[PDB]
Design an enzyme around this catalytic site. Structure first.
Site, PDB file in Angstrom:
ATOM      1  CB  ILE A   8      15.586  -8.284  -0.788  1.00  0.00           C
ATOM      2  CG1 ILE A   8      14.463  -8.635   0.189  1.00  0.00           C
ATOM      3  CG2 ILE A   8      15.402  -9.018  -2.118  1.00  0.00           C
ATOM      4  CD1 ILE A   8      13.084  -8.184  -0.277  1.00  0.00           C
ATOM      5  N   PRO A  52      16.238  -2.607   3.146  1.00  0.00           N
ATOM      6  CG  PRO A  52      18.293  -1.884   2.276  1.00  0.00           C
ATOM      7  CD  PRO A  52      16.825  -1.976   1.949  1.00  0.00           C
ATOM      8  CE  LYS A  77      18.274  -3.695  -2.225  1.00  0.00           C
ATOM      9  NZ  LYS A  77      17.404  -4.633  -2.984  1.00  0.00           N
TER      10      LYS A  77
END
Lengths: 117, 117, 117
Positions: free
Chosen positions: C64, C1, C32
């Site tokens: 993503i 991120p 993440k």
């Protein structure tokens, strides 16, 4: 709308209140109430625009709905160039704009997204 | 092309003229005349990269045509990492790049958009 | 991120270590690894948010996979609003978030792109 203006003018060469007048102008130009309009100004940066480091500014305009076509953006461009050249005392060759469409699922407001407001 | 470099190096630890050398390098790497290349450097920021606040830099590259595939961006990335590691005295582990395709209808220039220029 | 936070709070009104705490919070909220999380804070800017120049902040979140739907972003928004309001001592009306999906071919890392890593 979310506007972001980077400039290599020092802060003390950017007219006071520019972010407020750009907010009002963007509301008028883009057809949005001012309470939906956002402006960020980042002065004093090191910049080249069109290969040159003379005073310049880069404007980014992101919005739902109104910045997604060449013909719409041509109209907006003329109005934003008129506003910025005069405010910043810059020639038309020292400003560029980028336009970015947004959708409601991308915008977080009061702890949700606009899809649910 | 529109390049934006954010770094937590203080301004007085970013080599003088980096914006000019990055403009020239980006022209060469991306295959564009330098008078179409734009660079913005924002130093002195508070940053974490890969979860670490050690000195680092983030580069964003937005361009028409040439930044839209993995193979194209791999080619550019190698050259940009070589340039930035040497300029900033940073390891490859302290730099990340993001690539953003643009289209002509998004670029405002001299009061219109590039679709009509 | 990749998180980017613009604020018109002066640097000396942004609590020390904010970028570290935001990095850790983003890892948890977005699911993440912390060593994949990036945060950039740009204080002392001139900003209008919702037409007002009172203290405010704008957060951009690019990632993503996880910021591409309204339902995902509704949840992320609630969590990031909770974090930013308390950390910056700002009301919910003084923060907005934008979410931007990325793909692996856009992320330059160690001289290539993440497609090949």
């Amino acid at each position: 709308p979310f506007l972001e203006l980077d400039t290599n003018l020092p802060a003390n060469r950017v007219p006071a209140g520019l972010e407020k007048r750009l907010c009002a102008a963007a509301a008028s130009i883009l057809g949005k109430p001012a309470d939906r309009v956002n402006v960020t100004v980042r002065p004093g940066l090191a910049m080249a625009l069109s290969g040159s480091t003379e005073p310049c500014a880069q404007l980014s305009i992101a919005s739902i709905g109104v910045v997604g076509t060449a013909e719409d953006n041509r109209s907006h461009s003329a109005h934003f160039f008129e506003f910025l050249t005069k405010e910043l005392a810059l020639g038309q060759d020292r400003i560029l704009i980028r336009f970015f469409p947004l959708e409601s699922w991308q915008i977080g407001k009061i702890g949700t997204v606009m899809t649910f407001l």
